[PDB]
């Protein structure tokens, strides 16, 4: 849990990447909070080929799946944290919803497969990093 496994790729929040992720690095983007590493096993997930703006994600802090409506991906100014300085984060989709420390990594899904992964939140919002344009994963 906390990652998307598609083909021979593992997709994780960049800020949560492991040593083994970096050893097997395929691609990373700080402005998206995304990192993709190589795997030895084939993954089970599918990347949604769609423009759905409703779906379900897993919330780690509640151990529950929740339905969610979220904005189209956008450039969003995200305030400083112990993970990044204040910056523009692109590809970020916002929903009203619960979040707490440790929720980053929860996978957002629709009928077409994986849509994104929890990256940010606060002030009553949850921000998901969209992955649907990374067509090279699938």
């Amino acid at each position: 849990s906390g990652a998307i496994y598609v083909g021979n790729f593992r997709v994780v929040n960049r800020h949560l990447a492991t040593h083994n992720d970096w050893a097997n690095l395929v691609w990373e983007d700080s402005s998206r909070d995304l990192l993709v590493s190589s795997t030895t096993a084939q993954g089970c997930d599918t990347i949604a080929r769609c423009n759905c703006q409703t779906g379900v994600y897993y919330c780690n802090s509640r151990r529950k799946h929740y339905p969610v409506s979220f904005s189209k991906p956008s450039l969003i100014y995200v305030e400083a944290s112990e993970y990044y300085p204040a910056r523009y984060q692109s590809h970020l989709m916002l929903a009203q919803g619960h979040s707490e420390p440790g929720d980053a990594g929860g996978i957002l899904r629709c009928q077409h497969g994986v849509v994104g992964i929890v990256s940010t939140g606060g002030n009553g919002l949850v921000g998901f990093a969209d992955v649907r344009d990374l067509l090279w994963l699938d």
């Binding site: 929040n13 979040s99 420390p101 990256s119 940010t120």
Partner: peptide
């Protein structure tokens, strides 16, 4: 960006 989260990861707490």
């Amino acid at each position: 960006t989260l990861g707490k």
